[PDB]
Amino acid sequence: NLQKIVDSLESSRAEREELYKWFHQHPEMSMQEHETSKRIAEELEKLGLEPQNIGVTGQVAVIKNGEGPSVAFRADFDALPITENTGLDYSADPELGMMHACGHDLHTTALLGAVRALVENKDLWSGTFIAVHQPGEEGGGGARHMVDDGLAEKIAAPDVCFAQHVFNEDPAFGYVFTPGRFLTAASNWRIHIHGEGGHGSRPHLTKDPIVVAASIITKLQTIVSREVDPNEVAVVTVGSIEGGKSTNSIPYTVTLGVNTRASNDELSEYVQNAIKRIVIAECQAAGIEQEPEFEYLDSVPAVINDEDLTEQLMAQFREFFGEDQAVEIPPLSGSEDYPFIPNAWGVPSVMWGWSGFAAGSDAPGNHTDKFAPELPDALERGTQAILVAAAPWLMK
Amino acid sequence: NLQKIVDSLESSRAEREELYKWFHQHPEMSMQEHETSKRIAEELEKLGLEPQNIGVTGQVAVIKNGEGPSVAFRADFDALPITENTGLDYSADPELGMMHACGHDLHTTALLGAVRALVENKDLWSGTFIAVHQPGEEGGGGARHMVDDGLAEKIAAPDVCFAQHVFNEDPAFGYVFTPGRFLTAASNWRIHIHGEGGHGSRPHLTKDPIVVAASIITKLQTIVSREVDPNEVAVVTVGSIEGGKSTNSIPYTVTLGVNTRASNDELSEYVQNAIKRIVIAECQAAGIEQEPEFEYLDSVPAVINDEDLTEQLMAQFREFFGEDQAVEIPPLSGSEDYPFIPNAWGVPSVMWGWSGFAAGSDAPGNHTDKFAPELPDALERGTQAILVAAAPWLM
Amino acid sequence: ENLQKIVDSLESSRAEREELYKWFHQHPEMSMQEHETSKRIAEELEKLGLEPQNIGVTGQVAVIKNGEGPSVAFRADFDALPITENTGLDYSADPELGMMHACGHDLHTTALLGAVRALVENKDLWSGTFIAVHQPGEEGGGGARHMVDDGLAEKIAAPDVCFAQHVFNEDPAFGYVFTPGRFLTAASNWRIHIHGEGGHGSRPHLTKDPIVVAASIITKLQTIVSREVDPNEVAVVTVGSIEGGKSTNSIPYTVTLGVNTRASNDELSEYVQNAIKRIVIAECQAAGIEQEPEFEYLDSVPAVINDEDLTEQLMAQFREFFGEDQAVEIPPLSGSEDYPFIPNAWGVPSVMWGWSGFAAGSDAPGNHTDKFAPELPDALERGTQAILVAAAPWLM
Amino acid sequence: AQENLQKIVDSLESSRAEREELYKWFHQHPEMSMQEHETSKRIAEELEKLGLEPQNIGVTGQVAVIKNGEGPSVAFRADFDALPITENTGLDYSADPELGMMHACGHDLHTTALLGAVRALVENKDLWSGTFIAVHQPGEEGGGGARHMVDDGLAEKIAAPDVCFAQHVFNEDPAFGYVFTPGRFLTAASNWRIHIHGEGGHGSRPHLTKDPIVVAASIITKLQTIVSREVDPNEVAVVTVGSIEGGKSTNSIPYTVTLGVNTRASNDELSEYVQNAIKRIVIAECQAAGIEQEPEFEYLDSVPAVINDEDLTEQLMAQFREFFGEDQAVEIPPLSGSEDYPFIPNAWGVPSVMWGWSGFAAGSDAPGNHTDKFAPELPDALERGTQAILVAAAPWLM
Ligand SMILES: C[C@@H](CCc1ccccc1)CCP(=O)(O)C[C@@H](CCC(N)=O)C(=O)O
Ligand SMILES: C[C@@H](CCc1ccccc1)CCP(=O)(O)C[C@@H](CCC(N)=O)C(=O)O
Ligand SMILES: C[C@@H](CCc1ccccc1)CCP(=O)(O)C[C@@H](CCC(N)=O)C(=O)O
Ligand SMILES: C[C@@H](CCc1ccccc1)CCP(=O)(O)C[C@@H](CCC(N)=O)C(=O)O
Ligand SMILES: [Zn+2]
Ligand SMILES: [Zn+2]
Ligand SMILES: [Zn+2]
Ligand SMILES: [Zn+2]
Ligand SMILES: [Zn+2]
Ligand SMILES: [Zn+2]
Ligand SMILES: [Zn+2]
Ligand SMILES: [Zn+2]
């Protein structure tokens, strides 16, 4: 019955690939995914479903098929402010300065494909499936937005909840699982350094925030290089910097965009507090009078996969796909806001990874301007995973 | 004669200040000053003159008044990409992100008021006066543009050529002169650091150009702090930096905006070549594969004022304004493209400064978001100075 | 039965063994120049009726034969560190020496000599061969390699198994810690010489100032760990010493950096060291320095890997003898060791474990602080007992 | 220029061999500031050889008064400390490189010039009239040596002269010539040791440490912004970190790093500004690293900018130009170096000039002071230094 529903996907592959390409060409910023959200709703309605608009642009649909267990599956849909440079025939317009550089369009299309399979083959399963389409995953607070907009009150809990993510992974087109800690705790901040501007030839009459900002970025390197146990995992990335316009003037303000990662909450707070200590001291070293501003954007805890359920899924994937197609890996250094969803329902959860590339780990990585999951396999594998994962509950 | 042309200015003071406030509210980028250039030409025509469009947006008007000596005077008109924060009634709209933070609007209105006073009093003077309204002074190459658009061919060389610049100087509302080296040699560059982007959590799969750019900015300080004779004058300013968008991604490119100063041409070249050496080595340190790019914007040699002509003017200004009102100062650390103008004509030249503020050097400096020369005196004193400098040739 | 009796035999010699430890504590010597320490070790072996063989400059090996049966080797190192002792112990090394046993190598040595004394005084209680290996120059001195290169494996018949241990500030208090497989990190140690051009402090423009360059290098080296290494890996770059110049008003010619690296494996170890070279060269080039920097190799070691079956066997043995509480498995440490050159020369399986020397466990001062002072009697007794407990499955 | 002047100068040929041997002796006995035992003892002996009575003032300093008839009084100062620099000249009279000491600033030459001049004066008392005071000063290289002499009662022990001079050898143009600056000649300086106190540990466990080597590196780098950003480009400022020391084993993280720091500034206000900026930076860098212990600032020495008496400088320039030739004595802009010398004439309350002379055929292309190659060339470097003293004194004494 699992094999039958998977085989039924071949009929719709050409339509599903065109839908993926459409999403690829409509990349939108966190919590502003209006065309994307509207299309997801339309696709769900096309299947006779009643998508519930939760968390501004979020969409949740319940596929009812009699008595039985209930499985939820989550897929996010926001893109990134990166100019597409893939040369794909279906590339987003480079003019947009936006790109699905993390595969969220693929996650979305995978989920819509699985929903379609389930809706069109109710003879092959029993129970309930909940499709959860989440906005704003790229530090936008999207999972929290859905939870705060009454997700757990509006939608009855499932028995289990799953999600997945595409990346440049080995084995090519295979699946990767981690029981227990899978990802890292993260935060995202903007840091505003306020100096005193002036003429480029009279620096002694200024407090030069560009020199201070440079000194800060350099000193921040010492958090990971000297302050964190070498056996732990920690990252401080400064992903953006902006200040000044004219070459011959010293500006007033420099803004830094900062991202942190750590193995656990305590160490995540440690890293963030070290950042604040350094930024304050660097301003003091320069004699800057205005306190630097720390603007919080988002934070997430480390994703922890239910141990028993991860093992159950690995056994199921190995059975269906072959032993070497589903492999256990150590935790990734990435992060995710996904668990806010299963935790609001109070249900166990597993998130896994899959490979979108024949070159596996040699392919360009997520958040490069070249990230381009390979059709047809990347889409077929993500779509099939959802069905395979659901089967022990819905076809058993 | 001079006191008579100076006194005639009160009758137009109201209109001249309205004009200044107009330019103040239309700040435009170097070489792109379409509205201010248009209004400069309109104002010249209002007086019956025939302004010639030279160097994209530049405007030169010749005021012919019988045989006699010829005097050119230059005023620049470009503004800066700074958001105005003066609080003035006539402030440029803050959402423009533009401001006359160097007083170029004042220079222009002082020259338009002086042209008007000369046109309305042709019996009180004798010879020729050239008004040169120059675009793109702020590293735009404006003076060179005018020269390369045939300024020396289209306009007959005067006997002398002058210019002034307002700043926050002592004595309040007075004048300052420097014979010989007055300013520094300068250059302006954009430098592009090309790394390899990726995910914020996987820096090992990237070549992070923000960390490299930070390293460069810090290393560049050693040019002035270790490589230049402590007795010399050198400056390396990084006035802008831009790269990345999302906080959780590592970008591909960072652009630095860089400005140099030096007391002389050889030192100016030494500084620029040191910047290149440092940028190249910092990229190599990170294992960056792409060469960094050096994008030349502009350069000027140090301004040198004719020593005899400077002394002559100092004497003239002290006689008319008062002994204490026109003083000699040591060279400033700033720069100017002005001398390409007189040098194309092959004429002796002086540029001086005047104070636009009651607080003098305690007032906000040029290129701050608060730089606002004080009416009426700031415009009054710059307008008068032009006539007073012109006198020994025309009166 | 016989294990307990041999351990119990230690009680009567406790006073003498503590004074011997204090003697070593007060004679800390530099790596490969442990003249007095080596002489005393030989004298202590001779007073037990043994024939110490001088191998590896200052190294001493004694073979204790006691009839037919298996052979066990045990290694203890004996070099100290150039750290001024600051413990306030009544048996402190003279602070004027500027030398201290800040790593407990005196304790390792005394533990081994005590266990040897037990074995020779109780030959009725065991059978087979015990090999005491006293190794110099472990602190980056290449001591293990000196012993091997001076014919250890040709002069001394291979044992069946080879062991070693190290004291540190560990939990549980006075307990033992084990790690099967990778236990430590690959390391290297270098001196790096930066050659500038000196001059008068007031005329920097006539110099190439190697202090400012050295400062630049130390800062830039932080980006190896902070940016160039996988966050999930283990890597360290420590600059442990710096020296250049004498007069405040002069710009010197040379600055020397003492540098130490750690990495989880050989490939990453080589990466880190190559990255150091690339940074040092570029920073000298950034300053316009003409003379090439010099890289002076001191020592390197691969990651210690404990034999997996043997570690399990020892874990089970220690838990049985001391209590389940008192011997625990721990994740790998970030430190390193040259020990394995010894068993790999003989071609025998090996385990190295740790023991706690402190009531406060991990809250006590750590190795290489100027306060590191393992607590008598427990620290010595537990180290001495471990050797006997580990050898017992073979000798008893 | 005079006939008696030329005669006294000519007399130097008779003593040149012994004077050069003496210079070579001093060169081979370089000693640390305020610890110049053998050099002080030899200076005293050389003055005693000439029948003079040297007075030991300021620990190792020596002053001799030569009175010879009625007339004005001229004092001349020469310093005698060396530097902790390993000599690398390859001179046959090099100091032993194992000593780790060298006269890298020419103070041995200054000293021998002064002793040679004193000898010429003592041997030719028929050619002059008045008083000459030889002032041999220790500890000039930030040792507080001029201060030590003043504090040990120089001005109460030795009657004031009418004028007081000093000179310094360097790699200057014209070759073997003289350079003068009326008014401000040098820069205000200070010298400090700065002690950074972290928390040590094992090299592989940096998270249990506060690493002072990383902090010291960040300090040295950040200190560059004082000159590069905080000081008016038209001014003169220097911040040099001349020494750094911390740690011993490569695989440990140490507890302390010491920085040796030197400042220069055109005036007293700016000098204080720079020093206070150093303290702000050091304190903030330690706080950035979360270091609990306060860093320590250990004051060594400071001097104001040397200012030469304007009229006296013009008098000396005219005198040297007459005697040596116009192109041999030139006016130069202020140098960026410093000197403690003026504490001496200021204690006596008398006008003063210090000038410079060139010790090298290659002039400014020769090795600079405080290089390990600094080697003033005999005979000319010594001859020209000795002559200058006699030429300078001549308007008063001849
Ligand atoms: C799950 C992981 C896939 C890519 C990756 C693979 C291996 C190691 C690092 C990252 C990251 C997914 P992401 O969508 O980009 C989540 C974003 C934002 C997470 C957050 N809200 O903090 C991130 O910065 O990590
Ligand atoms: C002349 C000087 C007045 C402001 C000032 C006064 C004292 C010290 C520094 C600057 C600066 C005039 P400016 O319009 O700002 C010239 C601009 C551009 C000059 C150039 N084209 O390189 C500059 O960067 O220096
Ligand atoms: C085994 C470990 C105990 C101390 C420690 C404990 C936990 C984490 C790090 C170090 C260190 C032993 P060590 O004598 O200090 C080895 C030395 C020298 C090793 C070498 N030859 O590279 C080192 O630098 O690591
Ligand atoms: C007078 C000058 C000669 C060398 C020089 C020449 C040109 C430019 C700078 C220095 C330096 C004499 P010095 O003996 O080296 C004085 C020392 C010490 C002065 C002090 N006590 O602060 C210094 O650091 O400046
Ligand atoms: Zn992403
Ligand atoms: Zn994603
Ligand atoms: Zn300007
Ligand atoms: Zn301007
Ligand atoms: Zn150790
Ligand atoms: Zn050890
Ligand atoms: Zn010196
Ligand atoms: Zn000197």
Numbering used by the authors:
A (entry chain C): 4 to 399
B (entry chain D): 4 to 398
C (entry chain B): 3 to 398
D (entry chain A): 1 to 398
What does the publication say?
Precursor cleavage is then performed by an Nα-glutamine aminoacylase (N-AGA). The N-AGA enzyme releasing odouriferous acids has broad substrate specificity for the acyl part of the substrates, and a wide variety of Gln conjugates are secreted by the host and cleaved by this bacterial enzyme.
The availability of the N-AGA in pure form allowed a detailed characterization of this enzyme, and it was possible to resolve the crystal structure of the enzyme bound to the tetrahedral transition-state inhibitor at a resolution of 1.75 Å, which we report here for the first time. Thus, a highly selective transition-state inhibitor could be developed, that binds this enzyme with a Ki in the nanomolar range. This inhibitor contains the substructure of Gln, the non-cleavable phosphinic group, which mimics the tetrahedral transition state of the amide group and a large acyl part for high-affinity binding. Each metal-binding domain contains two zinc atoms and one molecule of the inhibitor bound to the active site. The tetrahedral phosphinic group of the ligand is bound via its two oxygen atoms to the two zinc atoms offering to both of them a fifth coordination partner and mimicking the transition state of the substrate being cleaved. The free carboxylate group of the Gln side chain is bound by a salt bridge to Arg-264 and by a hydrogen bond to Asn-251. On the other side, the hydrophobic part of the inhibitor resides in a large hydrophobic pocket formed by the side chains of Phe-170, Leu-335, Phe-185, Leu-186, His-168, Gly-337 and Met-354, excluding any water molecules. The hydrophobic part of the synthetic inhibitor is larger than the acyl part of most natural substrates, but still has ample space in this pocket explaining the low substrate specificity of the enzyme for the acyl residue, accommodating a wide range of natural and synthetic substrates.
